[PDB]
Amino acid sequence: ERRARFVSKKGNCNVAHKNIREQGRFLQDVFTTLVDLKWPHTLLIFTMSFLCSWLLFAMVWWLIAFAHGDLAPGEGTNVPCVTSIHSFSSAFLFSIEVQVTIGFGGRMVTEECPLAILILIVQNIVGLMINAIMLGCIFMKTAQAHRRAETLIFSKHAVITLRHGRLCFMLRVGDLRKSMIISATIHMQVVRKTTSPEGEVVPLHQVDIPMENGVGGNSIFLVAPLIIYHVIDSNSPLYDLAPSDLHHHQDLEIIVILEGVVETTGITTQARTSYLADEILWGQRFVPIVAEEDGRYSVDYSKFGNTVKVPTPLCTARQLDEDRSLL
Template sequence: MRKLNLKIKEENDSGFSAVASGRFTNKDGRYNVKKKGINIFDKYSWYHTFLLLPRFKFIGVLVIAYIIANLVFASIYYAIGIEHLTGIDKSSPIQEFIDVFFFSAQTFTTVGYGRIAPVGALASFVATFEAFLGLLGFAIATGLFYGRFSRPRAFLKFSDIAVIAPFEDGKALMFRVAPFKNNLLSEAEVTISAAIEELVEGKLESKFYLLEPKLKKINTFSLNWTIVHKINSNSPFYEYTEEDFKNADIELIIMIKAFDEVFANTVVQRTSYISSEIIYGAKFLPMYHSSEDQKTTVLDLDKINFHQKVSIDN
């Protein structure tokens, strides 16, 4: 393991452990931590879980929960007996269960078309309880939809790779990020931490270093931002060669904080890069250009990873 320049100050407040396993931060910005020793009801914030679910998974969970709830109540009505529901004609068991299922759906949603109605105290009690659960369930679902819709987010797209490219009279570590929605971001600020695995007293431990970007803050964030960390004597990567970058266990932990002018709130997004995602001897290609009428700047977000190989003098 390569010994780092002793002039570099270690970061002691990274919040991560020196002996943690795997990457510290996943590509989607979530911390790579699995918590045990607590029951499932205290372990998860269900509100946060549903807010952070991908869109199709969120909708899928709601649809599946709705179908399961109606299947359960349909089974209860069917067990009570279809003679306690008016409007259902005796036919095949499958057709009878289908009619009961749609009666349950109408009760759950409080639509109540009127063709089928409960008869007797037991069926009426079940229908009353189901209607109550339906109102409660749709209120929760509506709140979750609103929470997902109104939650401030940065909507930033990071490059999948970082590069080591020629810069000024030496070289620099670079990655880039761009806003991909029509939100208005300003006062964007970046923080870069590097976790480098070192051999300490015969044990491998991760040492954390705060990397100084060439430009830490920008006033407006409308185009892509190529974030540059110059590799000089103040960098933990000083005198690193291509082989060093390949063989070292490195993770770059990125956090970008910006102000969303529409929500009037601060938004944060994270990501990380590990050694296999750092390309030595490459530079990013331009990803924006002028429109044909020369009146608008066009940002090609599908080019955020475009790069070309270049030579670096070590």
């Protein structure tokens, strides 16, 4: 009726974590929690933190003025604790001036009441600390780089075809922006149900898939849309994959993880995708996407996931290897 992916086509790890024995670890890390939130949620916490701080000390200043006797609407017999305080509105407006450091000067702190001097110190230190903390969280949200990872693009359906005789699992990845991702590194994993001879039953086993690079490494230079193909050798877990068992309800999935730092902010990112068994086109190829032009190369992203059919065996690499050896 329905299939449960491991990761969606745009990352978004589709696994539900349950029975988390909470010890407050979610809330103890306040700072990383604030950054993870959206922007409209951040502004509310941004506003409430400042509004409460202004209002908390607004109650303090009004209370101090009330107790000092300068809230009596009469002749100025004494020297007021803080001048021009005639209501909570004046006290609340004065609190804004001190903490935002606007300092109009109509409501000025005098030297009469020593308590105000101590409270003025407390509000400045609290005001400085909130600003320092709020700026730090805003900078980590400005340096957020998950939005850049959304411009990293993977082909809708990957294909399996023959390369240099051997069979390989092809795949196309592209970069849309003009800013390079430094030291890109793409890992491929296959998530499948499997049992061990000893009696183990691992529900979603993740076996790393070698990328078959020119030096056996992982780093890929990503400017034009590459074709990331895994050469299906005798050690590959896809060594026994055939078009017969490449249908929808097959416990087969290929997770792809494209790491690499963003050159602008210097913040490492990640791009994730997966290919269900029905999202694979056996025995097809990716059309040439780059054509040289009068001045430079071109990349026709309109032909990104366009795949065409070509002659291809209908047997697994296991059967193909036996046929090659026997012949």
